[PDB]
Amino acid sequence: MLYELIGLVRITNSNAPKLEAKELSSTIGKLIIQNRGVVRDIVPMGIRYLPKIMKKDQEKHFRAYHFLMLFDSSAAVQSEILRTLKKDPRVIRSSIVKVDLDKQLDRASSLHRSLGKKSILELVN
Amino acid sequence: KEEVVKYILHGKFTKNNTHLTFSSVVEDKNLTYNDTMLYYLNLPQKVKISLSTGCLGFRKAARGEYEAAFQTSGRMFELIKEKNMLNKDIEVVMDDFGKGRAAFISALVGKEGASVVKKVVKISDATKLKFGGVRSPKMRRL
Amino acid sequence: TLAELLGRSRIAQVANNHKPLTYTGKKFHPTHQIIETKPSTLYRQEWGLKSAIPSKIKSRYLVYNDLDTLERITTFEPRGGTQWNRLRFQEMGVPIVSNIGRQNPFFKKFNTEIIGTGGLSYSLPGKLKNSPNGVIQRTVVPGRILNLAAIGGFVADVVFFQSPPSSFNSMGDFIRMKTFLFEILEASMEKNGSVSMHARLLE
Amino acid sequence: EPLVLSKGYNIEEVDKFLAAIESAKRERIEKLEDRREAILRILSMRNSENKNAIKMAVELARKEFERFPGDTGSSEVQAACMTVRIQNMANHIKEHRKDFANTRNLRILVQQRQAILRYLKRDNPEKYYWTIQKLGL
Amino acid sequence: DSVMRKRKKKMKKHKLRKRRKREKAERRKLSQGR
Amino acid sequence: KIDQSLSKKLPKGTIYDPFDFSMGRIHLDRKYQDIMKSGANPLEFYARPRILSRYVTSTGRIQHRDITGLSAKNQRRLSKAIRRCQAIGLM
Amino acid sequence: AEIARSSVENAQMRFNSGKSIIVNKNNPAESFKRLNRIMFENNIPGDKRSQRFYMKPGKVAELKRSQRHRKEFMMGFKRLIEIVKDAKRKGY
Amino acid sequence: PPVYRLPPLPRLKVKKPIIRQEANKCLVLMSNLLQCWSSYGHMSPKCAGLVTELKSCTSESALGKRKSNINYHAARLYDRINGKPHD
RNA sequence: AUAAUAGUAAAGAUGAAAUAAUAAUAAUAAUUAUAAGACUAAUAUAUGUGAAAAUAUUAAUUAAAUAUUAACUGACAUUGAGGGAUUAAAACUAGAGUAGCGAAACGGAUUCGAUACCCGUGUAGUUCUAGUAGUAAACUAUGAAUACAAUUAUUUAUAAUAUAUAUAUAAAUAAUAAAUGAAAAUGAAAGUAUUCCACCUGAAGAGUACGUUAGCAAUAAUGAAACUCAAAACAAUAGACG
Ligand SMILES: [Mg+2]
Ligand SMILES: [Mg+2]
Ligand SMILES: [Mg+2]
Ligand SMILES: [Mg+2]
Ligand SMILES: [Mg+2]
Ligand SMILES: [Mg+2]
Ligand SMILES: [Mg+2]
Ligand SMILES: [Mg+2]
Ligand SMILES: [Mg+2]
Ligand SMILES: [Mg+2]
Ligand SMILES: [Mg+2]
Ligand SMILES: [Mg+2]
Ligand SMILES: [Mg+2]
Ligand SMILES: [Mg+2]
Ligand SMILES: [Mg+2]
Ligand SMILES: [Mg+2]
Ligand SMILES: [Mg+2]
Ligand SMILES: [Mg+2]
Ligand SMILES: [Mg+2]
Fold first, then answer.
1. Where in the cell is it found (chain G)?
2. By the CB < 8 Å criterion, does A95 face chain F?
């Protein structure tokens, strides 16, 4: 089951912002692969400012680093990945959402589909 | 240090009464980058002159009228002029669409708020609404 | 059969369209078939359509979309300005040639694009036009400056030696009132069917 | 079972197909193995939905019951197809007590099954009895 | 039923409810032990 | 000198008419006056606030189908996508 | 600190809501009018007015339906009168 | 676009024929004078001509100068313009 | 709601006023900072979806769902007494929860009076978890199914057309023809027909009493008679009245 992810990570360090994001991406990707899963794409997005001053437990955030991870897994695995994301202090907002494979097998991320490229083959070419 | 960046003119205009409030945005010139940026975003304010249209001797019902509201606005403007909080720029905000709101804006436009207008950088409404929330009172029969 | 006669007949001949009669966008060529009457037929309100047309219309020409609608009125507009633009263009006598090096389309599955000109000019470029005074080298045409110049039912790009201040700056945005003479250099026609004329202001 | 695939695939066939592709590429290792593993993970039952598993079970039931390869509406095969869904629906209900719409749906489904077995009994009694015995009824 | 006709029924229902309220202690006495 | 509202600027390649110079033409013009309409489900754009913000009022409200001028289904998809967006941080 | 200084109130502009406008010193009244228009478009005063009391959910649904109907009638009327005007213009 | 067909109505007619006439000159002058007297104290000679103009306007009567027939075309053409089905 | 900041005399309420956990113990308004519940702005049309109750912040899981083709089954169908399951709001029994609202109660107004309408405190209740109960203007006041009948306009989906055209289908929604109807009006049903179930036979008395069953209970279902009238009811008409 192809699940897209959107995590808005924390950026504490000013000079080197992407490090925490990169670590998060590594860890969640590691979890996925240990657990019968297959990460397809890890689309980065920019250091984008949040719409409002969004706050985690005993913290506050105005800017964050955004990224999509487009992975396959079981439902239980995914649910648990989501839970771990919710638990951790270095992400502000997390959101897993299903990508339906009833018609196709190759499906790109939501952003790529919006641009034009339906399958990841198109992106490759 | 205590540097006044700008003033904010707040006006809460309810059904029955107006509340005009002047306040200085006090920035200190003097830690993590994110924390500093957050501080810069939401600078502390200090109240300078509070005012409500009963302060101008309008008792009970007459304080829910713009005539009282207009007078209060004029008094506020006079206080601003005299007490000397006109050196930096001003930011107007409003609430709750009363009669007094209409009076306040008219006062600002006219000669009563002549000295203030030139420092007023931005008008910016901030009325509160609810996306569901607490249930309101039952609609009075009358 | 009747069906064959209907197919032949003059209402079937008018090719149908539901384009707006009021089109406030850019008009590069005619939208609708212009339809004239004779004066006699106008006098008894007959245009060769489904119904009689209102006696308020005194113009002989019109344009239409529907013979009859749900509103119980034919959708028409009493105007045939496009014929006059064509006639003006003919009078001006500036032959349209493709500025791109290509053969003239009139000589030698379906292509809906405009075959050369749309048929505003079937004139050929090689002719001169003599008169009592002599052979006309420069085509003299009166037009109006807008700010571009309106020259005989066409807007045209304009050029000059020096920009005249006395005529222009005296009435800055009432230049449309005063008619100025023009020397039309050439007329090119683009893919969209717009006639791109080029004139020169004479004084 | 451990190497069962979703989407109407078969693991033996998939491997053969991959080998054929490799041969074609050669004509025209670790990485290839990793890609194959990724493909298997994608097409595995345990990563896929329950719906695919149910569909597979229904297909299996049809294969078992079909009195010839073409027939799919055989009263017995219909009953068998109903049963798999009923089992799954029953399991769902056991998880979710107050889901009353889906209990109703289950109920309808077993009523339909009963009706078709009743029909089978009238038409062809021995066959009906055999079907019942198979289904555990 | 029009509204006017309904109003008689409503009134009857109200009267019945009142009677039940009145005869609560009496009803209780009657019910228990017999 | 004169304002822009009371003078119709005829484009370069266009045809005109005597009527076209008039006040009445200008009035007529005044009277008579996208990626989601193009034919792609708006629920691809839930990680694209920039594009979804076009279908939203200055405050943040979603615009009505009378305003936005969409197919009913396509409008509802757009609305869904917007709501998803604001559930996430982005938008 | 240096980084914060460099970010010269960049977020402050985009963070604020649409209920905000920069005043032209030549015409404050114009600015106020524009703000009022914006508020009207967003239906904020009308929303505020609605929120003063509670109305039973079926009753508010009925009201909403009635409003919708009224809207649709008005644009049907507009359509009709535009046709009438066209007919008048032409001669019908 | 979304067309909106009305039901069968008794009579197509503008509900209120607001004429939308221009505001009175005398009233405008009076408002201007009032605005001037807001500024510049009570009665300074900046508004010396304005007062005179107001007086001239309001000499014979307090106001200077003292209907839209759209019903006729709608009323006439309603039965035509209907998409009302046949009898 | 609590706390801090600075700041000054009223604030809050109403038709106008007061009473109150309002305020010279320093409030209200403002700006911050914590917590708590409960609700879900726009989109929205309840369009649609659901058997009906219902059902619009987001996501995931499991379940069910549309159309057209291909193949298969071979009348397996319809309706459905009894029966079964679900069934708004209020109510009740436990155990949490309790911001706002708010029966009752108390207080202030209003009034000749005011056990009210308005205002203030505000308990049950409203919220969740597990149940009980099985009623509502539970309404489209219209039981379900099938075959059929004259038009138009709207959308929605399907197919072909040479992706954007004008076409063929369905589906819904809105105007009607015919037909039906006490009329209002119904309009693919309140038409033409066929099938099956439920129910009605003057008004009062009465969905009352007695009885029985079920429920923790409130109650729910079942459901008479005497006595008394020539009444009682609906659609529409023209007035008078507001
Ligand atoms: Mg209260
Ligand atoms: Mg059955
Ligand atoms: Mg009845
Ligand atoms: Mg039903
Ligand atoms: Mg909503
Ligand atoms: Mg049945
Ligand atoms: Mg409800
Ligand atoms: Mg309850
Ligand atoms: Mg309780
Ligand atoms: Mg009370
Ligand atoms: Mg129950
Ligand atoms: Mg009852
Ligand atoms: Mg009942
Ligand atoms: Mg209901
Ligand atoms: Mg008839
Ligand atoms: Mg009959
Ligand atoms: Mg009707
Ligand atoms: Mg008995
Ligand atoms: Mg009972």
1. Mitochondrion
2. yes
